Design a protein around this ligand. Structure first.
Ligand SMILES: [Mg+2]
Ligand SMILES: [Zn+2]
Lengths: 199, 489, 547, 497, 119, 99
RNA sequence: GAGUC
DNA sequence: ACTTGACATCCACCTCACGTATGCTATAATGTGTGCAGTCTGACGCGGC
């Protein structure tokens, strides 16, 4: 997962590149009991096959110049025991499972929550794995504000302006337009029945 | 030194000069190889006193025979190390810095005296905008904020009588010039006429500050600091861990960076540097002083090498882990012991079971004393060696000292006064202490691993108060209800 | 994958997977759902729903921390890629290791989720390994925590045991996984259930997540089963969508496999849980965790059957890989000859079990394995061959069983105080095994080399006699408080004595060299048997004869 | 089109406390004129320096000073170093051969003598003599003095101006603040006469009964004119030319000061980039960039436009130097000198090599070999390497302990220890009384027993009456006495101390 | 009784009273008795109620107050006023390691009090 | 565990903490309050001085106890001096009034 | 991390 | 009981060697680099809006 996310690692000039092939776990340098004795961390070597490829500037993208490759040592990775334990400087340690609020969307309501009035305050929370946080909430007079990286409160509409939506496109996508024909001196709406709903 | 009363007032830079026994010029602490303090450095013995009892730096003058002999070469007085607990040093800042507490702590005395809101003063101090000190020219008045562009377009036309500046220096100046007496009178008359009720409360507040200030005898210009006093070194010590490692106080880090920046200040003054870099350096100056006093009260908190906050002087005072709550209203104590509680059915009301080895240690000194009276111990050194060899005669005499000595039992929580009570303790071997069943209710104690402490009233008066006022037997009725507290269950 | 799945299910989309970055349409549509709820089209999702909370195992934690090492390394990598010459310099000269190993040691070493194993007993270990914390990075704080999150959420059913959490401030934060419960791919907790096809209880097992659980209608384990077919009662007892009550046979969709699936492991071991209030129940589980192995293992007479599984899984015992016949039995080695049926034509059929005997646990406890079977005996795959300390033949043996009588004694049993017989001492039951580690450390300073010697100022031959050549304790020595274990000497500075001490030195005439007694002594109160000694010499300095 | 943008953004600045943001904003005003933009100002530097050097040439004491200082060093046999290394240093637009020095000095002395007789003849600067004076001023200009000794020369003028200003300030305070005489009238008379006292009484000659009551402080008033008039004698420069030189030398100096500022500003941005390259959690941002600034100052001052090479290249090294040397200087609690510092650099950079090549940790032996020195110095440097640790480091996993709560103080003895101390002294005096008069007093002062001062064996002998060795035998006798167990039963318990 | 410790004056005697100033209820009663028996200008007062925190922060002793909470603000108050603490109460003595003005210490403490009366 | 006298704290000069150091147990606010309710001034002062931060006091009282005196002879809390100097360092003038 | 109420 | 003579030991004080402090390196390099973790509790007083 990590490898493909970053790789392949391309240089500035667009002619040299670093590519990832595959990895290998060695046999552990130090055994279980022994590491216990000397105060060592129990680990295996990780060695990874990496290839340096060089394009030419002048020839279009001719990978025909230089191809160098090898297996480099990238350090020792702590190994797990047969028990499911870990050897940490000569003492037995365990990593505990961790509950958190899962990334995605939280639709939260503040029932009472705040106010003498006792007004209903709705907030959807945007939780990533990795990155800053997003909060959308209702102002007391029903106006929509954003907390960006919960810094403070400003108008939601501005964001869509940044995404190059004119006020016209905004209201189009949100609200439902109604056709208002003006003929002679009479004004006539294209009305759907279930808009009179309790009118 | 026996005193009646203590006064607290605004300090003057010159008073700091009196306390201070020398100027701390260098950020360095000590020489890495020769572990002596450096020159005019933070632990310099020339200023703060000699580290070792009756022995100067270079080692010319050791011995009791020498007192007060001030070493010609090194300049250190030969005396008690104890002085390093009390002699203060001093630092001359070339830029008068503002005192953060007087500014950033609400409502802020500076702001209230000047009738000036926060941002104004801030932008002044930080060098974001200029301000009018005093104009012979009627055009502008006290406390006028201007931008870079407004200062030049206004200085083009006039000048001479026109005084405006930037920073803590300017604010210091505005403080000296302001007439406290006059302003008292001004505000009195305003209040005597239309008194918008809310506005009137603020008018009262300002006048009370002023009168309080002039009665106390404190001068406003003292809010701006020129001299910084430096804490005695023993109070911010530097010591070696046993493993070879060193631990030093965080104040010393802050102090060090304070000195660093201050020295670069002096350098850039000498250079006559462009004022942009000058202001930038003075901002850092204030950063370090303000971080020193109260870190994080300035906004951006300095972190330690980890990520955890560097702990400032103020923090040492205020916190619950600060000196008041950890070291002042409560403390670590001698002559105390502790362990698990267990039943004593045979114990009578005023008695408690006290484990041998605990008691042995508890009453060590009394042992030694009475050992020398009966001559059973040649001297005290022999008495120690006797105690370590645990002879049966030791116990006989221990018992005799312990006779009619009442000792104190404590359980957490100490809810009401009966959380601590006195008993005649009687020795039992075994490692658990025995308690009377009747008093379990008062302590809210029960046998399933609760731990209790025991203390020794040491003086005759202590023993007295324990047996009379604290004795279990004397206090049966609850301080709370009129009813009996020590009751069966 | 996680964020994407839950996000797409929040707005009622269709694609399961997605790209990491937020596509612009997503943003608009959620603001739509906010405006919806403000009008009343849809309603609010709960913070504490088990579908709204996700768990991190090992790999995903590892994943994240590995990515961080990578980030820093990327700055370095892209930097050195452009300066130098492209042809003659190779990949191996490019690559740094420091920050990789740094990131790793930070995770494993610095993390608060990484802790000392609880090795009081097999129970503590096994339980502690499956404990689940709400704290840590990206997770809840003490002040940030009100009532809602700490209290009992209905979704914890069959997933987390409700009754295993530390008392005091951390209560509600840390909980034990229930028995049969496991994590799906996504890091959501699932619980297994039996399918019920039109009234008939099948043998088919289906794991459901919290989300999926919210949908269907499931009968409790206690409902009575009609001859491996249908139900006893025409109106039956079940739960669905977070509430409980009555339904007819035909409406029955699913069912619990066993009662014990609601309970954690520790709690499962307590027998008549049914008759114990949860207040004390909770305390019970915690108590088990603080129990200590005596030497003698007496099998628990009143168990839940679960003691066999507990033992087996703890993994402190030896289990038979192959089965066959036992060739050699030692209180140190168990060697086993395999069934010819199972035996690989690759290697020989000889399985080896060197047993671990008498080592030091973290809590000062003793770690002692005892072989269970006898010589030349038959065993099969998965037979219990040697027991850990608190284990009998197959079973968890936390302790021992005694004849107890309920009644008052002359105020010796007052408020839960315990009266015990001398017989307990006499029979050596509940005699604890402790193994403590003591250390001695020889360095060098400006004051000169500290070293290890038998020579110490002003001590009797009492101490001298118990020491070897180098100043070392003899193996098997019986030692008490005040006794010196390992001799050490440290260089003193100047001795500036008071005038009185100057004269006295002269008078008795023992000058005494410029040295300090640094020797390691037995702390007072504790006393016992030096069983083994280990030494770590330096690489530079020459070895001691003891060495 | 710069400062007015600062204003709109500073209006938005919601009390922006970050000095980071403030500095970046301000330096953002100043753009960098490139190419010869810098060299524009380089020209102006050189012109200012030369103009004030023309002033030095015109001032007589300059040549007298030069010859006098040379003569001091030269008189002591023939030293090439010290004061000769400080002066001279004539640029070629070296180990100094006495041959060329004797030659180069010759023509200046020729010109000295030749510039004398013409001046006196008729006028100080009558036409012809003004032509020859210009010729002498061109001879001096050919030299460029080393800045150190040059500063001392400007201090021979600047300080003179300060004495001028100071003495006038005293006169003006005494006259204007104590008496009250129009400075307006002052202008004309002071310029017109200078040399004679005609002005004083000409002023009083316009009546005004205030000039009448001046008798009381008359003895002080014109006598203070003494100090002013005396400075004239001492220097021998005429008032008219004094004025011209002061102001125009002030001109030269001010050209340079106002200039350097421009250079600094346009290269501020360079400092920032350079610093941030080594802003590794080693010191701290602000600290480093301030030091970087210091490096830039160096660059501006030593840079010559004559080199014809790019500014950025040269300055880079000055600022980098400032940064590097400054971490070494400050940073660490224990200050570490430079050569030590660089050895440390070697350490960690080769650590990486050896760790990867050998496989694991670098043991001292192999490291010793690979770095070209003896093992001794390896282990030494190893332990010295470590920095100070936080006193209030939370070692309490729960904020139970700031490591201060571990600290034990060996300085203060226990009350147990004090018990040791007091009893021992008491016991000593008790057996002291058992000793025979003079014997007791001997030991008492020999060891400063109950006497602060322990006199040594010879000093004891001085007080007694000569004899040193007799006291060594009294010593053996007193030892014998106190070894008696009957007396030392009290002393015997301390046998184990 | 501790909560009603302080009062606000509407109207002066001959002292430093005035409009709205808040002083201890006991000190005001002092003025009462002296003035009314001799005549002099009276004071109209209103009794003021201060819960817990307020009452603690208003006490004579700034050591007491500073020991409680709000160390920062306390210090500035006191420093500016030039306040003088005579060490009357419990906590004051406590922190100085002095004998309490109560119980055992009351007999001896009134002894010390008459030592302050004698100059 | 139990302590008579042993290793003391560096800055405040009180006994260190826990059985770990052979430390003296901490006497908290609440516990102090107990003594307060009784009239008991001397025990209080013991806890305040001879048992904690007064070096001269504790040492002197130890040996007087060993000389069969049991006399108190109070001193001055070293924590108090610590406190004083920190106030001076933060730039506020605080001084002990003579009677 | 666990004990006490 | 005390001084002389001889030698032996030790503390002082001055000398020699390493430690310390500073200056220069001249292709060109120039507003961009840190850094994230704080968070949502919770009733409250105060100040400001
Ligand atoms: Mg209990
Ligand atoms: Zn000296």
């Amino acid at each position: 997962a990590a490898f493909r996310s970053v790789f392949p690692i391309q240089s500035y000039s667009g002619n040299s590149e670093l590519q990832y092939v595959s990895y290998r776990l060695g046999e552990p340098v130090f055994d279980v009991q022994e590491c216990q004795i000397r105060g060592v961390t129990y680990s295996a070597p990780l060695r990874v096959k990496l290839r340096l490829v060089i394009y030419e500037r002048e020839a279009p993208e001719g990978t025909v110049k230089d191809i160098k490759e090898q297996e480099v040592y990238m350090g020792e990775i702590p190994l797990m025991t047969d028990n499911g334990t870990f050897v940490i400087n000569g003492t037995e340690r365990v990593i505990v499972s961790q509950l958190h609020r899962s990334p995605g969307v939280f639709f939260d309501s503040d029932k009472g929550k705040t106010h003498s009035s006792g007004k209903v305050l709705y907030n959807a929370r945007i939780i990533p794995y990795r990155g800053s946080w997003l909060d959308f909430e209702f102002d007391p007079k029903d106006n929509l504000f954003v907390r960006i990286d919960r810094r403070r409160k400003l108008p939601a509409t501005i964001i869509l302006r940044a995404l190059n939506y004119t006020t016209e496109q905004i209201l189009d996508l949100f609200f439902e337009k109604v056709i208002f024909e003006i003929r002679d001196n009479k004004l006539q709406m294209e009305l759907v029945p279930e808009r009179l709903r309790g009118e | 030194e026996e005193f009646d009363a203590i006064k607290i007032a605004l300090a003057s830079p010159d008073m700091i000069r009196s306390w201070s026994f020398g100027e701390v010029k260098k950020p360095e602490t000590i020489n890495y190889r020769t572990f002596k303090p450096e020159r005019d450095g933070l632990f310099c013995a020339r200023i703060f006193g000699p580290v070792k009892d009756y022995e100067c730096l270079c080692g010319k003058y050791k011995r009791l025979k020498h007192r007060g002999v001030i070493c010609e070469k090194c300049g250190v007085e030969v005396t008690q190390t104890k002085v390093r607990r009390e002699r203060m040093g001093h630092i001359e800042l070339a830029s008068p810095t503002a005192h953060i507490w007087f500014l950033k702590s609400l409502p802020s005395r500076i702001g209230l005296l000047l009738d000036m809101p926060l941002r104004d003063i801030e932008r002044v101090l930080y060098f974001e905008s200029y301000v009018v000190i005093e104009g012979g020219m009627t055009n502008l008045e006290r406390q006028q904020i201007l931008t870079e562009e407004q200062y030049l377009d206004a200085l083009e036309e006039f000048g001479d009588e026109f005084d405006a500046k930037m920073g803590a220096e300017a604010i210091q100046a505005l403080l000296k010039s302001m007439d406290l007496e006059q302003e008292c009178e001004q505000l009195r008359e305003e209040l005597n006429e239309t008194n918008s009720e809310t506005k009137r409360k603020k008018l009262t507040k300002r006048i009370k500050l002023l009168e309080a200030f002039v009665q106390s005898g404190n001068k406003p210009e003292w809010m701006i600091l020129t001299v910084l006093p430096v804490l005695p070194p023993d109070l911010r010590p530097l010591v070696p861990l046993d493993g070879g490692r060193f631990a030093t106080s965080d104040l010393n880090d802050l102090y060090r960076r304070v000195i660093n920046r201050n020295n670069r200040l002096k350098r850039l003054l000498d250079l006559a540097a462009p004022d942009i870099i000058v202001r930038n350096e003075k901002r850092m100056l204030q950063e370090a002083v303000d971080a020193l006093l109260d870190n994080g009260r300035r906004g951006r908190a300095i972190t330690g090498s980890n990520k955890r906050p560097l702990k400032s002087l103020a923090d040492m005072i205020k916190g619950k882990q600060g000196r008041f709550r950890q070291n002042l209203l409560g403390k670590r104590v001698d002559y105390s012991g502790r362990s698990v509680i267990t039943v004593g059915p045979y114990l009578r009301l005023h008695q408690c079971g006290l484990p041998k080895k605990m008691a042995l240690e508890l009453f060590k000194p009394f042992i030694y004393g009475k050992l020398e009276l009966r001559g059973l111990a040649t001297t005290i050194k022999a008495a120690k060696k006797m105690v370590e060899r645990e002879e049966a005669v030791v116990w006989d005499i221990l018992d005799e000292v312990i006779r009619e000595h009442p000792v104190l039992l404590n359980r957490a929580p100490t809810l009401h006064r009966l959380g601590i009570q006195a008993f005649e303790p009687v020795l039992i071997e075994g490692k658990a202490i025995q308690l009377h069943p009747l008093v379990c209710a008062a302590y809210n104690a029960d046998f399933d691993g609760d731990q209790m402490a025991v203390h020794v009233p040491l003086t005759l008066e202590a023993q007295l108060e324990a047996r009379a006022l604290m004795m279990s037997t004397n206090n049966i009725l609850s301080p709370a209800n009129g009813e009996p507290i020590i009751v069966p269950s | 994958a996680v964020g994407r799945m839950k996000f797409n299910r929040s707005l009622l989309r269709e694609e399961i997977e997605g790209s990491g970055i937020l596509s612009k349409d997503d943003i608009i549509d959620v603001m739509k759902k906010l405006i919806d709820i403000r009008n009343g089209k849809g309603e609010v999702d709960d913070i504490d729903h088990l579908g709204n909370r996700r768990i991190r195992s090992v790999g995903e934690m590892a994943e994240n921390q590995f990515r961080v090492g990578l980030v820093r390394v990327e700055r370095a990598v892209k930097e050195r890629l452009s300066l130098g010459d492209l042809d003659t310099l190779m990949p191996q000269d490019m690559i740094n290791a420091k920050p990789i190993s740094a990131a790793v040691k930070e995770f494993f070493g610095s993390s608060q989720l990484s802790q000392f194993m609880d090795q009081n007993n097999p129970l503590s270990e096994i339980t502690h390994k499956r404990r689940i914390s709400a704290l840590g990075p990206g997770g809840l704080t003490r002040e940030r925590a009100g009532f809602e999150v700490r209290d009992v959420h209905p979704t914890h059913y069959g997933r987390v045991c409700p009754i295993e959490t530390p008392e005091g401030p951390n209560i509600g934060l840390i909980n034990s996984l229930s028995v049969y419960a496991q994590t799906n791919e996504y890091g959501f907790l699932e619980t297994p259930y039996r399918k019920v096809t039109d009234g008939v209880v099948t043998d088919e097992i289906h794991y459901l997540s919290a989300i999926e659980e919210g949908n269907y209608v499931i009968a409790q384990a206690n409902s009575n089963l009609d001859e491996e077919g249908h139900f006893v009662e025409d109106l039956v007892t079940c739960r669905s969508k977070g509430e409980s009550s009555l339904f007819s046979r035909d409406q029955v969709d699913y069912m619990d496999v066993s009662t014990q699936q609601v309970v954690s492991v520790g709690a499962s071991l307590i027998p008549f849980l049914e008759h114990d209030d949860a207040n004390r129940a909770l305390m019970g589980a915690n108590m088990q965790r603080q129990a200590v192995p005596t030497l003698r293992a007496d099998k628990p007479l009143v168990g839940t059957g679960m003691e066999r599984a507990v033992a087996v899984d703890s993994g402190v015992t030896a289990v038979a890989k192959r089965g066959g016949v036992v060739q050699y039995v030692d209180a140190s080695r168990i060697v086993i000859k395999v069934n010819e049926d199972e035996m690989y034509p690759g290697e020989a059929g000889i399985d080896i079990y060197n047993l671990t005997k008498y080592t030091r646990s973290n809590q000062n406890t003793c770690i002692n394995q005892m072989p269970c079977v006898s010589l030349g005996e038959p065993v099969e795959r998965g037979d219990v061959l040697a027991d850990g300390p608190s284990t009998d033949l197959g079973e968890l043996a936390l302790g021992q069983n005694m004849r107890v009588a309920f009644m008052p004694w002359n105020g010796y049993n007052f408020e839960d105080s315990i009266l015990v017989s001398e017989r307990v001492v006499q029979e050596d039951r509940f005699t604890t095994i402790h193994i403590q580690e003591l250390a001695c450390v020889s360095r060098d300073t400006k004051l000169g080399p500290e070293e290890i010697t038998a020579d110490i100022p002003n001590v009797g031959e009492a101490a001298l006699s118990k020491l070897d050549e180098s100043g070392i304790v003899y193996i098997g020595a019986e030692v008490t408080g005040g006794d010196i274990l390992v001799g050490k000497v440290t260089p003193k500075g100047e001795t500036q004595l008071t005038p009185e001490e100057k004269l006295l030195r002269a008078i008795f005439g023992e000058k005494a060299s410029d040295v300090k007694d640094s020797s390691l002594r037995v702390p007072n109160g504790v006393s016992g048997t030096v069983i083994d000694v280990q030494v770590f010499t330096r690489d530079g300095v020459e070895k001691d004869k003891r060495a | 089109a710069a400062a007015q943008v600062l204003s709109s953004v500073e209006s938005e600045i919601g009390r922006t406390t970050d000095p980071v943001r403030m500095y970046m904003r301000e330096m953002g005003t100043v753009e960098l004129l490139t190419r010869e933009g810098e060299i524009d100002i380089a020209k102006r530097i050189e012109d200012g320096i030369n103009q004030v050097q023309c002033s030095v040439a015109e001032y007589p004491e300059a040549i007298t000073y030069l010859l006098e200082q040379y003569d001091r060093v030269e008189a002591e046999e023939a030293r090439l170093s010290d004061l000769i290394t400080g002066f001279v240093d004539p640029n070629a637009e070296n180990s100094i051969d006495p041959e060329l020095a004797r030659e180069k000095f010759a023509e200046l002395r020729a010109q000295y003598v030749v510039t004398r007789d013409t001046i006196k003849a008729k006028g100080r600067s009558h036409a012809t003599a003004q032509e020859e004076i210009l010729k002498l001023s061109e001879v001096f200009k050919q030299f460029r003095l080393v800045p150190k000794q040059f500063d001392y020369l400007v201090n021979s003028m600047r300080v003179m101006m300060d004495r001028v200003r100071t003495q006038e300030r005293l006169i003006m305070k005494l006259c204007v603040e104590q008496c009250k005489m129009p400075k307006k009238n002052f202008i004309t008379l002071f310029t017109g006469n200078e040399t004679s006292d005609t002005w004083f009484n000409a002023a009083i000659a316009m009546n005004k009964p205030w000039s009448e009551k001046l008798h009381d402080v008359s003895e002080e008033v014109h006598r203070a004119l003494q100090k002013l008039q005396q400075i004239e004698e001492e220097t021998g420069l005429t008032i008219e030319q004094v004025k011209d030189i002061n102001r125009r030398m002030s001109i030269g100096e001010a050209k340079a000061r106002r200039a350097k500022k421009e250079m600094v500003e346009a290269n501020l941005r360079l400092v920032i980039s350079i610093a941030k390259k080594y802003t590794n959690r080693g010191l701290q941002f602000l600290d480093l960039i301030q030091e970087g600034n210091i490096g830039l100052m160096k660059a501006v001052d030593k840079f010559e436009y004559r080199r014809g090479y790019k500014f950025s290249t040269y300055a880079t090294w000055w600022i980098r130097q400032a940064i590097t040397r400054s971490i070494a200087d400050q940073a660490r609690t224990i200050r570490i000198p430079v050569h030590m510092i660089e050895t440390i650099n070697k350490l960690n950079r080769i650590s990486r090599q050896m760790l990867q090549e050998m496989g694991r940790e670098p043991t001292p032996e192999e490291l010793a070999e690979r770095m070209l020195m003896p093992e001794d110095k390896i282990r030494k440097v190893l332990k010295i390497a470590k920095e100070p640790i936080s006193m209030e480091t939370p070692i309490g996993d729960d904020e139970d302990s700031h490591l201060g709560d571990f600290i034990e103080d060996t300085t203060l003895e226990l009350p147990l220890d004090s018990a040791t101390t007091e009893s021992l002294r008491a016991a000593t005096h008790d057996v002291l009384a058992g000793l025979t008069a003079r014997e007791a007093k001997v030991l008492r002062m020999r060891f400063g027993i109950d006497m602060n001062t322990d006199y040594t064996l010879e000093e004891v002998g001085k007080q007694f009456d000569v004899t040193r060795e007799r006291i060594r035998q009294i010593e053996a006798k007193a030892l014998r006495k106190l070894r008696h167990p009957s007396r030392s039963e009290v002393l015997r318990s301390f046998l184990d101390d | 009784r501790q909560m009603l410790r302080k009062a606000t004056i509407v109207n002066a005697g001959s002292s430093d009273f005035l409009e709205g100033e808040q002083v201890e209820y006991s000190r005001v009663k002092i003025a009462n008795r002296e003035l009314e028996a001799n005549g002099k200008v009276g004071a109209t007062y209103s009794r003021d109620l201060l819960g817990i925190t307020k009452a603690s922060l208003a006490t004579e002793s700034f050591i007491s107050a500073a020991s409680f909470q709000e160390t920062t603000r306390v210090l500035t108050e006191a420093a500016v006023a030039g306040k003088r603490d005579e060490l009357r109460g419990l906590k004051e003595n406590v922190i100085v390691g002095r004998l309490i003005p109560a119980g055992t210490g009351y007999a001896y403490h009134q002894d010390r009090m008459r030592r302050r009366a004698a100059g | 565990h139990a302590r008579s006298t042993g290793s003391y704290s560096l800055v405040t000069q009180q006994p260190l903490g826990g059985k770990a150091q052979f430390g003296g147990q901490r006497f908290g606010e609440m516990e102090v309050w107990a003594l307060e309710a009784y009239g008991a001034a001397y025990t209080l002062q013991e806890m305040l001085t001879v048992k904690s931060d007064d070096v001269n006091g504790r040492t002197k009282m130890y040996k007087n106890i060993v000389d069969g005196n049991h006399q108190m002879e109070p001193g001055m809390p070293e924590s108090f001096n610590v406190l004083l100097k920190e106030i001076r360092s933060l730039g506020i003038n605080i001084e002990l009034e003579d009677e």
